[PDB]
Amino acid sequence: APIETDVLILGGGPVGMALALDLAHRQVGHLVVEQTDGTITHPRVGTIGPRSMELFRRWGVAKQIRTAGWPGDHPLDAAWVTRVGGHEVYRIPLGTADTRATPEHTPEPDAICPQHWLAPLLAEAVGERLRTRSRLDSFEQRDDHVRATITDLRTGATRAVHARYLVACDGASSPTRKALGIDAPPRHRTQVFRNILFRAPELRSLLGERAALFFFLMLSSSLRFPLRALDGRGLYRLTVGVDTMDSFELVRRAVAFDTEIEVLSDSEWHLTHRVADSFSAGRVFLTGDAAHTLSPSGGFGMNTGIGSAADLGWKLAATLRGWAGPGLLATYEEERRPVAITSLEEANVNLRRTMDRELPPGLHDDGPRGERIRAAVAEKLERSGARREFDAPGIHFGHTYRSSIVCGEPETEVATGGWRPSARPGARAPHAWLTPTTSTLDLFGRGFVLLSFGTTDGVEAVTRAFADRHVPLETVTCHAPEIHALYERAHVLVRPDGHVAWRGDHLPAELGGLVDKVRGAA
Ligand SMILES: Cc1cc2nc3c(=O)[nH]c(=O)nc-3n(C[C@H](O)[C@H](O)[C@H](O)COP(=O)(O)OP(=O)(O)OC[C@H]3O[C@@H](n4cnc5c(N)ncnc54)[C@H](O)[C@@H]3O)c2cc1C
Ligand SMILES: O=C(O)c1[nH]c(O)c2c1c1c3ccccc3[nH]c1c1[nH]c3ccccc3c12
């Protein structure tokens, strides 16, 4: 008895679960298959970006993520040091969770949540629809659905699943991308690293006021990378480059204290810059790492994935419900790929900054002699814009879609200063508190939304144009002059994904035309 569902999600990692959460919130029947048993032994992701947090706010898991265990009094600072407990060279103070100032561009700042805490949270939200220890072996595309063979790794039995759509969130080495014959050429040189996970129970006490979330080491050529405090209560991770030495000894070399150290893992990995040439073929799609990979310098990886998952989510649901034009699905690649590429190049800039930084001779000496060399280095660090690696609002919220379903404005793209909120066509509708408890972002996520800051003339006609096409629409009349200034126009049409599709002080004459354009039937 072949099981059938609307969407088959290949991958139980961060990105596949987010996609499951989005389909769930859109009444789309779905099923997730994860080959592993779903537990985490070696945490990869630690920082949940703000944009991801906004989507989790909508899905109702943001709060549990923040109280998952990260200490509210632990420093979020990043610091360049010769060795942990050695000599400081440059620090970027970022407060603590309970201490930093409330952000103004968003309702959900970033959070610290190591993957072994995030997985249980996500599994519980996705619930019953997640199937662990299940591996997808192959898939055959038929006329109106995809047929896949799933091996139950528990009993050894194989079952078949017929779904209208097959979404592959199977990671960087996506077997699915290969079976379809799609190539994801490296845009930059591939590198190799080792990540050592360990427990150090008294390290925090010893560091006292010098405790940090990130310790960028400037010891040797292999040790010029971050040592991260994963859970703020004993767990740390040291990344080391490889162009042989014992695990424990590498950690001893990086940590200048005689304190208890317990090595747990020593995982080798490849940092790559690979984006797929195409994000789909037939009823089979690629999302997350299977579509785009980038250097972890900046922490953009999982966020760009969750972003693409949310994009595909509303477009899949629209085609399944019937109101989507035949050309809607193809905009997933049209819109997400360019974002993947630009985010990759920005991650590379951060990477090259520490790869090309030089480690002067007497950087380790004691006394004002070497202190002068450090002051020199710290100086160059400032000018190199190192802090851009730990403060990338533009990369988090500044991507603007320039596509066939977006009525873009003339204004081209040429950075002339730090990123600022914009309600321009293609961008993420900016945040503003309507009330102490409600954000403009809380109005988006379901169907199309039309914000009117002035006269509601024409709105009635907008409603009919959408109803005529069975396209879901919600009209909100807002007064707040502050929000009007931010959005700039009197009427703003926001897509189901929170991005602007059109804006103007006067609704257009051919509303049926606008409705057809924004739905992919242009
Ligand atoms: C050292 C390091 C640190 C990082 N830190 C961060 C960070 O702080 N923040 C951030 O945003 N990003 C971070 N990233 C990047 C981030 O980890 C990735 O972007 C993210 O994991 C991609 O998620 P994914 O769901 O697409 O795939 P993955 O997490 O790679 O998961 C793929 C899943 O597919 C499953 N699977 C594969 N094949 C099959 C099959 N045939 N059948 C069933 N299941 C299958 C796997 O078992 C796995 O669970 C980091 C990366 C590295 C290397
Ligand atoms: O995600 C990580 O913790 C992580 N793992 C890693 O291996 C990294 C990083 C991060 C990171 C996380 C949030 C904000 C900024 C960041 N820069 C780097 C970062 N920069 C690097 C440069 C070289 C090798 C590894 C990393 C690396």
TrEMBL record:
Requisite cofactors: FAD
KW Flavoprotein (keyword) present: yes
Ranges where the FAD-binding domain occurs: 4-342
GO biological process, one term: methylation
Domain of life: Bacteria
One Pfam family in the UniProt entry: FAD_binding_3
Residues given in the record as FAD 1 binding sites: V15, E34, Q35, R44, G46, T47, L136, D289, M302, N303
MF terms (GO), sorted A to Z: FAD binding; methyltransferase activity; oxidoreductase activity, acting on paired donors, with incorporation or reduction of molecular oxygen, NAD(P)H as one donor, and incorporation of one atom of oxygen
Amino-acid positions noted as binding FAD 2 in the UniProt annotation, renumbered to this chain: V15, E34, Q35, L136, R237, W269, D289
Keywords recorded for this protein, A-Z: FAD, Flavoprotein, Methyltransferase, Monooxygenase, Nucleotide-binding, Oxidoreductase, Transferase
Residues where FAD 3 binds: V15, T47, L136, D289, M302, N303
Protein name per the record: Putative FAD-monooxygenase
Naturally occurring in which organism (per UniProt): Lentzea aerocolonigenes
Organism lineage: Bacteria, Bacillati, Actinomycetota, Actinomycetes, Pseudonocardiales
Gene field: rbmD
